Every structure is written in structure tokens, then in C-alpha cells.
A paper describes a structure:
The structure was determined by cryo-EM single particle reconstruction, and the cryo-EM map was refined to an overall resolution of 4.4 Å. The [name] complex consists of a central core and two wings (termed wing-a and wing-b) and the overall structure exhibits an elongated arch-shaped fold with approximate dimensions of ~390 × 133 × 88 Å3. The two [name] molecules form a pseudo-symmetric dimer through tail-to-tail interactions. The coiled-coil domains (CCs, residues 746–971) of TSC1a and TSC1b interwind in parallel and form an extended two-helix bundle with the dimer interface being as much as 2386 Å2. The [name] dimer makes multiple contacts with [name] dimer and stabilizes the overall conformation of the complex. Each [name] consists of a HEAT repeat domain (HEAT), a dimerization domain (DD), followed by a C-terminal [name] catalytic domain ([name]). The cHEAT–DD–[name] of the two [name] molecules adopt pseudo-symmetric fold, whereas the two wHEAT domains adopt distinct conformations due to differently associated [name].
As a well-known tumor suppressor, the tuberous sclerosis complex ([name]) integrates cues of growth factors, energy status, and various stress to maintain Ras homolog enriched in brain (Rheb) in GDP-bound state, and therefore keeps mTORC1 in check to limit undesirable cell growth. Here we present the first cryo-EM structure of human [name] complex and elaborate on its characteristic assembly and [name] function.
Residue numbers in the entry:
A (entry chain B): 1526 to 1599, 1605 to 1626, 1636 to 1755
B (entry chain B): 614 to 623, 685 to 748, 758 to 937, 1015 to 1079
C (entry chain C), D (entry chain D): 777 to 825
């Protein structure tokens, strides 16, 4: 009993997890549910942004279990490692399922590429709480903004737009995205589901205190 | 007029001097705020400046010109809180924006910190940092020094930590520093770790940024803050509960339950990363496996730490 | 008579437009999978590299 | 009504010509990506070496 507690307790990495999701929209694909997750292809600026997001990643078996279910089967599954935050991207073009994976994540990325506006109503999702809309422009400088689920805008401000050039948009994008993911995990935990606390450290500390309580 | 003329998406640079003039004199009526609201979308569509040969500088100067002075009030709080967004949008052009003028507008933001509010100002500061960090390089120290005096505002609670984090992820910017920078950073962060006052989101984010800066913090002069830190920690648990809130800082040897867990995790992380840095993943060299494969083992819980011991029986040799 | 003339001109414009949009249709349908195959092969080369 | 619809269909054929020439430009960029694909094929042969 305590032995298997040691197995499961050991599992949860001291490296905070971040399942994120990337989308793409086109002119015809604007305000579409069956045309947003259809195309396995985006724009040119979309692709260069994607390859600028993170560094190369492969889903081989020789690498350890540090990858999650998203990106287990089919394809570059771009990611970014750091001191405690692991970031799996779930590129909308790398599922060939995709609806089951992209919808499940709390926060997602949506590249506004058509030229029209955007709302959460594009995809029902699972818990796609907050969105981050990014649109190109004539020159390199391109616009960025974010949208709530009309429920947590008190937690995460929404009237935050900003201009950002090419070599700086991926970083600030992923940054605010991580902030949103933090907000979403804090919200879920605030619903008190007795689930994995976002601070994996305090999580496994609870694990150990639970072992203690189990013995005594 | 302003409404129609600000909608050009195919005759230019005339409207430019028009705007220059109408902002130059202060009409002292709502029309001021009206054109100020006409600005930000014109900055979203500040795209036809491919024609205008960098005369925006003057309006930018004009901007800072009308940033301060009674010649504006000839709504002033709203004046500032709306002109800050327009220069915010303006900051995009790191190139055409004059270098000395960029220094000037950085100083304008520095003075906009001490204000009715600077949330917009501080997030714009994060943006300009990621954009023209060369300019911020000089302002950074005194910037943080003044930031020491925002006094635990739940309003600006989020954007500050956001900015500190973002900055931290930009090492080459702060590639050089000294103790006082980090000390001030931690002093600013610490109060935001209240178990009751701020947000659980704010709490966890604060602990995250504390940890990650303390990581990004130099290996030398790393132990220094450690007591202060836990001081800053124990001074956040001042009156929430005091069962065993004792110092326990290893400088000697070298619900509120959630707050206790917070203190636990933070000081543990520090102990793990004080005196050096090391990834938290062990992977034994093949020799180790060969030696102790299937070895006789035993695991104990001295405290919140999990200790495990394994002993070889020469499996590979007898193999 | 003016009605007749305008109607005839509009019908000819319609024929022109329909044939042009069929041209557009076929070329877009080829372009899509063209670039698909191109990027597929190229990124596979990148992976192998 | 008839003359108005004639003007309508005129602008229709016009934007159709616009999209047609820009579509030819897009197919041009497509064959440019194909040339880059053959560049990646040169990379393929040095890679297999």
C-alpha cells in the first residue's frame, strides 16, 4: 500500500505542467466550428510564428515520459522547457481526436489571420476558458489581445491589447498565455475539486503529509 | 471631421500636421478627450506613416509636452490615464522613435509610476523593455527603487508580478546587476504573499516569481536574502497563525495550513537551490545500475523529506 | 429596348464571371494540396536532418 | 434596377479579375515553394550522404 503510494507520489514532476493549444483561422474559416479544426494548414506568418514558438521536439520512445497525452501519436509537437514550466503546444496541424485534445486544455492560442473579429463561440471546447487573439499587420508590428470566458475577467484583465514586432511576438504571446493558464488552473482549483494543485511542489507535499496521516 | 478622416484604408501627411495642431493648443473641452479617444485606433492604424517621414517624433514630444503642465488644464487624471495608452500604442516603433526621445518617454513613464495609477504604465514598461531594452538598461535600477514604494496595492498586484516575471525571462537585459536589485525585487514581491489579503492566483504567482528570480539570482550573494526572505515570509505570517512560525533560517547552521505549506515549499526550494543550482532529476550512470540492480532496499520519512537507501549484492559480477 | 440591351450585357458579364470563378476554383484546389505536399516533404527532410 | 445591376456585375467582374491575377501570383509563390522544396532535395541528397 505504502509502496504504491511511493510510486504515485513520485510520479507528479517537480516540473509544473502546461498543456497549451494553438489554432488558426482563415477568411472562409471565420466564425466556423467545422472549418476551424478541419484544415491541417495555416498561413505563412502562422507557420513562421509556429517554428519561432519553441524549439524542435519529437515524440520518440527513447525520451522519458515527460510528454503528455497530447502529442503521443502523430507532428513536431513543439515545446519549451525551463526551470519549472514545461509547455506542450498542441499544434492544430499536428493531430494527423484533435477536438478531444484542443478542447480539453483550459487556455488556447488563436491566430487571428483572416481579418475579421473572433469570439469563444468559434469552438464549444471542454474548458477553453481564456483566448488570446493575435493578428498580423502591414509591417512587422502585429497586434495582440485577450478575451475572457465572461466568468473570470475579474481574475484576468481583458482590456489588454498591445503591438509587438516579429522577433518579440512569440515570447510575449507564450508569456501571457502561461499567465492565462495559471489563472485557469487557479480557477479550477478554486472550484475545490480536491484535484492536483497547480503548485506541484505543495501537491507532493500534501502527498507526503497524506502518507504521514496514513501511518498514524 | 476627425471621425471620418481617421478611416483611410486604400493624400496624406496633411492630416498629420492637422493632428499636430489640434493637439498642440488645448481646447480645454471634451473634444480633447474626444480626439484622445480618436488616437488609439489611429495608432492601431498608425500604418500609413510609411509616407510620413518620422515627424511622429514631434507629436511624441508634443505628447510628453502635454503630459505635464497647467497648459493642459488651461479630467487631468483621465488626461494622464488616456494619454498613457496612446504613447503605449506608440511605443511599437523602436526605430523611428528618436533615441533621446525614447529616453525621455522612459523618464515620462518613470514619473507616471508615482501617480493616481500606473497599471497601464507598468505594463507598457514591460512592453518597452521587451522591445527597446537597451533604453531601459539605465533606468532599471532606480525604476525598481521607486517600485519599492507602491505599498501592497491589490490593484497593481497582478501587473507588477507579470512585469517582474517577464523581465526575469530576459537574462541578457539584466545580465549584470548587484545585490540591491534582487533585494528590492524580493522586498516588493514578499508582501503579495498574504494568505488572506491577495488572490490565491496572486499568491501562487508571487511564489513562482520569487522562486524563479531566486533561481536567476546569482550563485554568489544568494544566501544573503535567505533570512530576509524567510523574514519577509514570517512577516507575512505575522497574524494568520503562529503555532510554529519560528525563524529556522539556515543562516544559523550555515486556510492558514495552506500558508504553512507555502512557507514550506518556498524555503525548501531555496535550500535546494542555495549554494548552487542543479536539475531536480536524477539518472544513475549504467555503472550504478549494474552494481545495485535488484539491490536490497529500504525507505524512510525522517520528516517531510523522503529518504531511500539501496544496497548492492553484486548481481552483475555473479552474472 | 434599353431593358433588352442592359439585360444582354448583364448576362454576358454573368458568363464571364462564372467561367472566371471556375478557373479560380480549379487553381486553388490544386494550390492547396500542392503546398501541402511541398511542406510535408520539406519538414520530413528537416526531421531526418 | 437594370443599370444598377449592370454596375454591380461590372464591379463583380472587376474584383474577379483582381482575385484571378492575385491567384496567379499565389501559384507563382507556390512554384517558388516548390523550388525551395527542390533546394531541400539537394539537402536530402547531402543528408543521405
Amino acid at each position: 500500500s505504502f509502496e504504491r503510494s511511493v510510486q504515485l507520489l513520485d510520479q507528479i514532476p517537480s516540473y509544473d505542467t502546461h498543456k497549451i493549444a494553438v489554432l488558426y483561422v482563415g477568411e472562409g474559416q471565420s466564425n466556423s466550428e467545422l472549418a476551424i479544426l478541419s484544415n491541417e494548414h495555416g498561413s505563412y506568418r502562422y507557420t513562421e510564428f509556429l517554428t519561432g514558438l519553441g524549439r524542435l521536439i519529437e515524440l520518440k520512445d527513447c525520451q522519458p515520459d515527460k510528454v503528455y497525452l497530447g502529442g503521443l501519436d502523430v507532428q513536431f509537437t513543439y515545446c519549451w522547457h525551463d526551470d519549472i514550466m514545461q509547455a506542450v503546444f498542441h499544434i492544430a496541424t499536428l493531430m494527423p481526436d484533435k477536438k478531444r485534445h484542443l478542447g480539453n486544455d483550459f487556455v488556447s492560442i488563436v491566430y487571428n489571420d483572416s481579418g475579421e473579429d473572433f469570439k469563444l463561440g468559434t469552438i464549444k471546447g471542454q474548458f477553453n476558458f481564456v483566448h488570446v487573439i493575435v493578428t498580423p499587420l502591414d509591417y512587422e508590428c502585429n497586434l495582440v489581445s485577450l478575451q475572457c470566458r465572461k466568468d473570470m475577467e475579474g481574475l484576468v484583465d481583458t482590456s489588454v491589447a498591445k503591438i509587438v514586432s516579429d522577433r518579440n511576438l512569440p515570447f510575449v504571446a507564450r508569456q501571457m498565455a502561461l499567465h492565462a493558464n495559471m489563472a485557469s488552473q487557479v480557477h479550477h482549483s478554486r472550484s475545490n475539486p480536491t484535484d492536483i494543485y497547480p503548485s506541484k511542489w505543495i501537491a507532493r507535499l500534501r502527498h507526503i503529509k497524506r502518507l504521514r496521516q496514513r501511518i498514524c | 471631421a476627425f471621425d471620418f478622416l481617421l478611416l483611410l484604408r486604400a493624400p496624406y501627411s496633411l492630416l498629420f500636421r492637422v493632428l499636430l495642431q489640434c493637439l498642440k493648443q488645448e481646447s480645454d473641452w471634451k473634444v480633447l478627450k474626444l480626439v484622445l479617444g480618436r488616437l488609439p485606433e489611429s495608432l492601431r492604424y498608425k500604418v500609413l506613416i510609411f509616407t510620413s517621414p518620422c515627424s511622429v517624433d514631434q507629436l511624441c514630444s508634443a505628447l510628453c509636452s502635454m503630459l505635464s503642465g497647467p497648459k493642459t488644464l488651461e479630467s487631468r487624471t483621465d488626461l494622464h490615464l488616456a494619454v498613457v495608452p496612446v504613447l503605449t500604442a506608440l511605443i511599437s516603433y523602436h526605430n523611428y522613435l528618436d533615441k533621446t526621445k525614447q529616453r525621455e518617454m522612459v523618464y515620462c513613464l518613470e514619473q507616471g509610476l508615482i501617480h493616481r495609477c500606473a497599471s497601464q504604465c507598468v505594463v507598457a514598461l514591460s512592453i518597452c523593455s521587451v522591445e527597446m531594452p537597451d533604453i531601459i538598461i539605465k533606468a532599471l535600477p532606480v525604476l525598481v527603487v521607486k517600485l519599492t514604494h507602491i505599498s501592497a496595492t491589490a490593484s497593481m498586484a497582478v501587473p507588477l508580478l507579470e512585469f517582474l516575471s517577464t523581465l526575469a525571462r530576459l537574462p541578457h537585459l539584466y545580465r549584470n546587476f548587484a545585490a540591491e536589485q534582487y533585494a528590492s525585487v524580493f522586498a516588493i514581491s514578499l508582501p503579495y504573499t498574504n494568505p488572506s489579503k491577495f488572490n490565491q492566483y496572486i499568491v501562487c504567482l508571487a511564489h513562482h516569481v520569487i522562486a524563479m528570480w531566486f533561481i536567476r539570482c546569482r550563485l554568489p550573494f544568494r544566501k544573503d536574502f535567505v533570512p530576509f526572505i524567510t523574514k519577509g515570509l514570517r512577516s507575512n505570517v505575522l497574524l494568520s497563525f503562529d503555532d510554529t512560525p519560528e525563524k529556522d533560517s539556515f543562516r544559523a547552521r550555515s486556510l492558514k495550513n495552506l500558508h504553512l505549506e507555502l512557507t514550506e515549499t518556498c524555503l525548501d526550494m531555496m535550500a535546494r537551490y542555495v549554494f548552487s543550482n542543479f536539475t531536480a532529476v536524477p539518472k544513475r550512470s549504467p555503472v550504478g545500475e549494474f552494481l545495485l540492480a535488484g539491490g536490497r532496499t529500504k525507505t524512510w520519512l525522517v520528516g517531510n523529506k523522503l529518504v531511500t537507501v539501496t544496497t548492492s549484492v553484486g548481481t552483475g559480477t555473479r552474472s | 429596348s434599353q431593358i433588352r440591351q442592359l439585360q444582354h450585357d448583364r448576362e454576358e458579364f454573368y458568363n464571364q464571371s462564372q467561367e472566371l470563378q471556375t478557373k479560380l476554383e480549379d487553381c486553388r484546389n490544386m494550390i492547396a494540396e500542392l503546398r501541402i505536399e511541398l511542406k510535408k516533404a520539406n519538414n520530413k527532410v528537416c526531421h531526418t536532418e
